[PDB]
Amino acid sequence: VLSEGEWQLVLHVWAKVEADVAGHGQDILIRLFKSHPETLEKFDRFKHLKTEAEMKASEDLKKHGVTVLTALGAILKKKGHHEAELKPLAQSHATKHKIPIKYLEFISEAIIHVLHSRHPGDFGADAQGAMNKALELFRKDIAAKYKELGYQG
Ligand code: COH
User: So where does O2 get bound?
Assistant: First the structure.
């Protein structure tokens, strides 16, 4: 469980992410696709994008980035009490999109990488540690739902 002080570090930097949701969303998805190409193959809607320039130019990719970060933000602001938000997400990602938990670890790494690039002064070691913990909590709760449904993996 994150302490109140750790949640404050997470939300203080998230308020900055919200100043440019679309720019952030885009950098995250691109970092994910370049670092872990197998992840792009899960998106029939983005599979045709081959280069980073092509990814940067896609307005549809930018729109999905806002969708991803908006959902994540609603979860983070619940400070661990995210049962109602997390459930629909685990169900669709496990049963409809077939996303293994490992890919959720990959996007977590991408989020941390981007926050670090864009907000050095608001993202020192202490904030990076709190953010990692918040993302691990998210994965842990989703992994439990996956197990229930028969998808742990
Ligand atoms: C490697 C693939 C991958 C990852 C790691 C991932 C991780 C995450 C993530 C973790 C931080 C968040 C908050 C979301 C949030 C969402 N994802 Co995904 N998703 C993934 C693949 C998908 C796919 C595929 C879709 C459907 C896209 C489409 O066709 O519109 C998707 C749809 C969504 C939607 C639309 C509604 C729904 O279908 O659930 C939201 C919200 N998500 N996703």
Answer: 64
Count the helix, strand and coil residues of the chain and give each as a percent rounded to the nearest 5. 80, 0, 20
- The closest-lying atom of ligand 1 relative to the alpha carbon of residue 45 is 29
Q: Which fold has domain 1-153?
A: Globin-like (1.10.490)
Residue type, 36: H
Identify the residue whose tokens are 């900055």.
16
| Spatial distance between the Cα atoms of 45 and 66, rounded to a whole number of angstroms | 15
Deposited resolution, Å: 1.6
State the closest ligand 1 atom to the C-alpha of 97, by its place in the atom list counted from 1: 24
The full set of domain ranges for the chain reads 1-153
* Experiment type: X-ray
Nearest CA to ligand 1 atom 33: 68
